[PDB]
Structure 1
Amino acid sequence: RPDFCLEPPYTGPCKARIIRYFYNAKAGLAQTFVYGGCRAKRNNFKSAEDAMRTCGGA
């Protein structure tokens, strides 16, 4: 899987509260995080299926 799948979730410097999904490689599951609204990194998806299709397995 892509090396960005191993990156921690990045809230970023903006102050919105956008609920997003990140792949948590330690758990092997897509989990939600609060995205600030600007300067999104790659481990930042709008849906669990996208997260999982991109970075999982089982």
Structure 2
Amino acid sequence: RPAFCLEPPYAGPGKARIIRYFYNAAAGAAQAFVYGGVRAKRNNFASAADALAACAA
């Protein structure tokens, strides 16, 4: 998988309240987190499906 997939989820400093998905490598699963709308890292997806296709491929 890309190194990006090993990164902890990044809420960032934004104030929005958007559920996004990240690949949790140690868990072997895509998991929800709250994304703030600003300065996203690359382990950040619209759905569990999109996280798994990028990283559990």
4+ long deviations beyond 4 Å: none
Please provide the CA RMSD for this pair: 0.8
* Alignment pair present for 1:52 and 2:52: yes
Distance 1:43 1:30 in 2: 10
Q: How many equivalent residue pairs?
A: 57
Segments of structure 2 that go 5 or more residues without pairing to the other structure are none
What is the aligned-residue identity percentage?
75
**Map of 2:41 onto structure 1:** 41
Segments of structure 1 that go 5 or more residues without pairing to the other structure are none
* TM-score, normalization by structure 2: 0.95
* TM-score, normalization by structure 1: 0.93
